[PDB]
Amino acid sequence: QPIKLARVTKVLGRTGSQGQCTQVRVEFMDDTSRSIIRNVKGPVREGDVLTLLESEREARRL
Amino acid sequence: PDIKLFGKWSTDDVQINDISLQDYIAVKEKYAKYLPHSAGRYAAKRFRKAQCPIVERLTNSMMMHGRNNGKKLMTVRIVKHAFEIIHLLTGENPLQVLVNAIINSGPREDSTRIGRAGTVRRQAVDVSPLRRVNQAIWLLCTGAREAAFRNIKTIAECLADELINAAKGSSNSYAIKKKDELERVAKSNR
Amino acid sequence: RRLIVVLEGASLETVKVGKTYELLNCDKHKSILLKNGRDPGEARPDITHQSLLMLMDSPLNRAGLLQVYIHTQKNVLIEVNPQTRIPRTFDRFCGLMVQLLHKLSVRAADGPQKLLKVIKNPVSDHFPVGCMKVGTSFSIPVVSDVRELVPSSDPIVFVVGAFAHGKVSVEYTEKMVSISNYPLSAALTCAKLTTAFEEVWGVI
Amino acid sequence: RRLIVVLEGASLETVKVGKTYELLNCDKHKSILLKNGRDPGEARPDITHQSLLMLMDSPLNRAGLLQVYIHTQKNVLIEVNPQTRIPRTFDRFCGLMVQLLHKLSVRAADGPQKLLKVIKNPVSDHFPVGCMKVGTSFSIPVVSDVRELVPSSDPIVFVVGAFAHGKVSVEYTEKMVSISNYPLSAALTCAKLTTAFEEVWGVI
Amino acid sequence: DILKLFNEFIQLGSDVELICRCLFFLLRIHFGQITSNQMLVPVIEKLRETTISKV
RNA sequence: CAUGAACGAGGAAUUCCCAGUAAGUGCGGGUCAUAAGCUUGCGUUGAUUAAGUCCCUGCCCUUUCACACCGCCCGUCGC
Numbered sequence A: 001q002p003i004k005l006a007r008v009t010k011v012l013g014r015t016g017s018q019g020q021c022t023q024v025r026v027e028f029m030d031d032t033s034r035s036i037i038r039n040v041k042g043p044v045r046e047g048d049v050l051t052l053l054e055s056e057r058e059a060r061r062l
Numbered sequence B: 001p002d003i004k005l006f007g008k009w010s011t012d013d014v015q016i017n018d019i020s021l022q023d024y025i026a027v028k029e030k031y032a033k034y035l036p037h038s039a040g041r042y043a044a045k046r047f048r049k050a051q052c053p054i055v056e057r058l059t060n061s062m063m064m065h066g067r068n069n070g071k072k073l074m075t076v077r078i079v080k081h082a083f084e085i086i087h088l089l090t091g092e093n094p095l096q097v098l099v100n101a102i103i104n105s106g107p108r109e110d111s112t113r114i115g116r117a118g119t120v121r122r123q124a125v126d127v128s129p130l131r132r133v134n135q136a137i138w139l140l141c142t143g144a145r146e147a148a149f150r151n152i153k154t155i156a157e158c159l160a161d162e163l164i165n166a167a168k169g170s171s172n173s174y175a176i177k178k179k180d181e182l183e184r185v186a187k188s189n190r
Numbered sequence C, D: 001r002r003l004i005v006v007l008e009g010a011s012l013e014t015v016k017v018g019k020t021y022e023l024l025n026c027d028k029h030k031s032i033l034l035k036n037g038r039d040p041g042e043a044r045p046d047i048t049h050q051s052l053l054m055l056m057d058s059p060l061n062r063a064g065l066l067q068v069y070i071h072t073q074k075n076v077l078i079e080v081n082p083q084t085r086i087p088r089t090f091d092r093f094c095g096l097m098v099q100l101l102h103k104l105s106v107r108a109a110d111g112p113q114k115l116l117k118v119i120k121n122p123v124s125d126h127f128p129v130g131c132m133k134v135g136t137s138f139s140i141p142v143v144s145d146v147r148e149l150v151p152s153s154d155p156i157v158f159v160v161g162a163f164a165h166g167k168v169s170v171e172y173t174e175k176m177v178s179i180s181n182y183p184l185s186a187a188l189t190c191a192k193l194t195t196a197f198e199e200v201w202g203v204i
Numbered sequence E: 001d002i003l004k005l006f007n008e009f010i011q012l013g014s015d016v017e018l019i020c021r022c023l024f025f026l027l028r029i030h031f032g033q034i035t036s037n038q039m040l041v042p043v044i045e046k047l048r049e050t051t052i053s054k055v
Numbered sequence F: 001c002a003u004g005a006a007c008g009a010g011g012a013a014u015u016c017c018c019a020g021u022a023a024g025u026g027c028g029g030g031u032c033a034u035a036a037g038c039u040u041g042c043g044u045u046g047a048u049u050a051a052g053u054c055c056c057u058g059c060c061c062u063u064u065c066a067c068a069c070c071g072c073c074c075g076u077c078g079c
């Protein structure tokens, strides 16, 4: 699976067990007009670029 | 005029190959300085240390453990000597080597922790670019510190070899092994 | 390549009687064990004592391919120098444990090297990174032969309990094995692991 | 077929102190051993103890293909029942042995079947017919693969010294072998010899 | 699946205000991804007639 | 002048700490209490991480008229 780059569109909040993780919404740099929800560790703000090794996983899935 | 680090290392030829880390590594024309000693206040506000030049960040991070606290001129001299050694051994711009080492040493995915008394359970998560840069600098400094300890080898030499190996991508460096193990743990429990 | 042996749940703790400090033994300290309602017959340093003799004289330890770790019941971790000469007879072994558990380290009599030392928990911090970690129990239905589990060039961790009853259950092990269709002792278990590794790795 | 293992140089005897009868230990009995100028450290009843534990608990013994005989330094021969259980602790084992040399036999606590009893000199006569005798020492320059020496369906005698120092030498052994190039304990020697006979006789 | 069910909830005529509030929020946040997919072309066609007529 | 002991980073656990802060270094005073087997001032050099949640351990409260939003916490024992 190719490595993907994503841009942070909305910072949703602090989740995880201890609040350490951050739920954000990200959109791919590809012209696919897609957007998913991801968990980030560390200080993250609007406009940041994330490297996804596997882009298929969803943070909030049954 | 042209601004060169230590009066001899240019910054125009230095380029960053990672799009994500372009906004968090301050080496370009506006952040080009003659010395990594500016007496600034970069910890005053959140996200402000991304505006600190990366050489000054390395100099700040090399003031450990304790026996080196507050001695910044010594660390500046160490960094200057390490850059000279890097240029002698490889023949390229030491700034480019430092940038490549920081790019390669940064983990891309980490693992979050849900822990009780019995066992701790484990999940994979992503890493923000600022934490990537911070952890890369920390790993490089720790590797140099542990390599120089109780050994006949100057801390500047060990730092030079750590940067050379990390920019090379070789597994001989401490930071590369730590990043690989963290990424393997994150991958194994997706 | 090295063999890492973890002795889990060792019964190593000190009690005081009269004016004297000595290791807690079931038979010797029967009276005081019934005091406080402590379960009699749990003070068994001998399983710990017997296993060490089995490991420390092994030809694998002779060639320098063994390192032994002891994790006692009271959450104390002990590292064993391969150069150490274990006290063969039980009482001087008991004196050794009391001295180590009090002074936190043991120096060699004729050498400057430290032989025994109490170190920081957990034991998983001290393993070589990425190594194989295997636990041994008779409870596993499938009997595994030791020799095909032996890595060709990598270190490996084997976990054996130092107790008569119960099951080994610790966090860092990832596959759990049975290697005989009989209940065996730890001393035999430490014996039958080390000889099979010796023939695989060319130690004869 | 059956494995026969014989223990020689066993330091087993009982000595009177005060009014009591005790198994002779260097540990417990420094002062008396220093009396009469007899050598300290020669009395090693412990070596016999653990060596039994590896022998008795071995699966082949539980498979029932194992008999053990002991020659003391006192030239006393004692049999052991396959269903005999050895005390894990040293002194409880010494609890039996003092009762041995006086009472000359041990019935089971749950029946008149004889767990222990002194047999007659020589033990060579008690050997099954058509059985070949192998003595073991480190000093033999050539190392033999143990799996080679096995008879397919025949009894075979192994003679393992229970002594501290010296070399095994008795008349009726036909040949000498070595199984390692390292100076080995009789304890693991018993474990190693039992180990190789496990596979060739198909007991797992 | 939700868009198909939301078409059912409007046409029966029950709880129009909350569903339309839910419906319009999803369309905005997924505007680009919806437009690319041609499978959704029949779905919005029924929504287009149903929603404006009922409101 | 001579000799050159333990000590190679300190277990089980436990305490404290968010910017001129942690830590290193020097120079003064003894002020109607305390302090000199010590306390208290003043300067010099000067960082890493973090700027948000209630998951654990706790604490403090609450559940009777612009436009827009929203549309009644539950039970027991007494009198």
Ligand SMILES: Nc1ncnc2c1ncn2[C@@H]1O[C@H](CSCC[C@H](N)C(=O)O)[C@@H](O)[C@H]1O
Residues within 6 Å of the ligand: C136, C137, C138, C139, C160, C161, C162, C163, C164, C165, C166, C167, C168, C177, C178, C179, C180, C181, C182, C183, C184, C185, C186, C189
């Ligand atoms: N047949 C066998 N195969 C593998 N391990 C065994 C074994 N027999 C005993 N052990 C190990 O030796 C240790 C002491 S034997 C104590 C009995 C243990 N509870 C049991 O399962 O039998 C135990 O930790 C057990 O893991």
Ligand SMILES: Nc1ncnc2c1ncn2[C@@H]1O[C@H](CSCC[C@H](N)C(=O)O)[C@@H](O)[C@H]1O
Residues within 6 Å of the ligand: D136, D137, D138, D139, D159, D160, D161, D162, D163, D164, D165, D166, D167, D168, D177, D178, D179, D180, D181, D182, D183, D184, D185, D186, D189
């Ligand atoms: N390398 C080896 N090969 C075979 N037997 C060995 C051995 N090393 C020690 N042993 C046996 O272990 C027992 C105790 S060692 C006692 C000394 C003995 N004479 C010796 O040669 O070392 C002896 O009976 C001896 O036969």
Ligand SMILES: [Mg+2]
Residues within 6 Å of the ligand: F054
């Ligand atoms: Mg809370």
